[PDB]
């Protein structure tokens, strides 16, 4: 309800390897960027080009 999670909240994405947690995080970041807002994606697992 409401169209999405409340702004400024902490959102956890849990799952086993290969579930799609990184895909969902990338979706969030891209959606935020498409609206003209800034976004940061701290990655401790992959390089920028590989991602």
């Amino acid at each position: 309800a409401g169209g999405g999670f409340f702004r400024g909240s902490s959102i956890l994405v849990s799952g086993v390897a290969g579930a799609g947690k990184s895909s969902l995080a990338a979706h969030f970041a891209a959606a935020a960027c498409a609206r003209g807002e800034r976004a940061m994606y701290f990655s401790f697992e992959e390089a920028a080009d590989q991602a």
């Binding site: 999670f5 409340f6 902490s10 956890l12 994405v13 799952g15 086993v16 799609g20 969902l24 979706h27």
Partner: protein
């Protein structure tokens, strides 16, 4: 997790000799949300959730869903055949009745 406002769990389960993807909101503070384990399927267009499962035995997913749909179609079709055969039977009885009346 003790602090998180929202929780999204993504599952990749092995059932019926094949792997199916699903996701659900374990908790969403300060709002009401769906309580369904919505199966999704990632593709070039992005992440896309399949239409909600309708009918009894909603746990079925993947090939099992198509198999259940086919089984339902077959059974309901044969029930229709049952009713049609009974109607034809009454057809036959009425034909003899009024032909006898004609004689």
């Amino acid at each position: 997790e003790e602090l998180m406002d929202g929780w999204v769990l993504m599952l990749n389960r092995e059932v019926n000799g094949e792997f199916n993807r699903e996701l659900y909101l374990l908790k969403a503070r300060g709002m009401a949300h769906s309580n369904q384990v919505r199966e999704f399927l990632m593709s070039d267009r992005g992440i896309s959730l399949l239409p909600p499962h309708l009918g009894e035995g909603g746990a079925l997913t993947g090939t099992a869903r198509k198999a259940e749909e086919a089984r339902l179609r077959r059974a309901e079709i044969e029930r229709q055949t049952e009713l049609g055969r009974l109607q034809q039977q009454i057809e036959q009885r009425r034909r003899r009745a009024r032909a006898q009346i004609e004689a």
